[PDB]
Curated annotation (Swiss-Prot):
This is Galectin-7. Monomer. Keywords: Apoptosis, Cytoplasm, Lectin, Nucleus, Secreted. Mainly expressed in stratified squamous epithelium. The lineage of its organism: Eukaryota, Metazoa, Chordata, Craniata, Vertebrata. One of its GO terms (cellular component) is cytoplasm. Gene3D superfamilies: 2.60.120.200. It is found in: Cytoplasm; Nucleus; Secreted. SMART domains: Gal-bind_lectin (SM00908), GLECT (SM00276). It comes from the Eukaryota. A beta-D-galactoside binds at W67, G68, R69, E70, E71, R72, G73. Induction: By p53/TP53. Could be involved in cell-cell and/or cell-matrix interactions necessary for normal growth control. Pro-apoptotic protein that functions intracellularly upstream of JNK activation and cytochrome c release.
């Protein structure tokens, strides 16, 4: 079951999402979605998708059900069995992903930031906390 964090007032530049958890020892993939609503099929402003099986971290958007052009971070700074800390930071020009102690990727806004209303974490992941600062 996905972890669904409603944010009815939305997010703004300076919003920090702090995600702490652990990658299960048998994990293949997990994701963090910033979605525009609570309904099924809602558009995704950001889809942040570590893929342990294919050694990549995919970034994308989704509109009217269709995935956009994939972007990728460098390598895969996640390991089966190991804890992680991810920051997703909103700015006027996009999202910054931070993993561990380092800036990881910058994802330029594709959808208006003001549309985001929900953070969804799904897939093969153990979540300890998802915090909005």
């Amino acid at each position: 079951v996905p972890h669904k964090s409603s944010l009815p007032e939305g997010i703004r530049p300076g919003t920090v999402l702090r995600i702490r958890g652990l990658v299960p020892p048998n994990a293949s993939r997990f994701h963090v979605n910033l979605l525009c609503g609570e309904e099924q099929g809602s558009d995704a402003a950001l889809h942040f998708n570590p893929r342990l099986d294919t050694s990549e971290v995919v970034f994308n958007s989704k509109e009217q059900g269709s995935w956009g052009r994939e972007e990728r971070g460098p390598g895969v700074p996640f390991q089966r069995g190991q804890p992680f800390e991810v920051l997703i930071i909103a700015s006027d020009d996009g999202f910054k992903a931070v993993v561990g102690d380092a800036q990881y990727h910058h994802f330029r806004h594709r959808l208006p930031l003001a549309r985001v209303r929900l953070v969804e974490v799904g897939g093969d992941v153990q979540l300890d906390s998802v915090r909005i600062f």
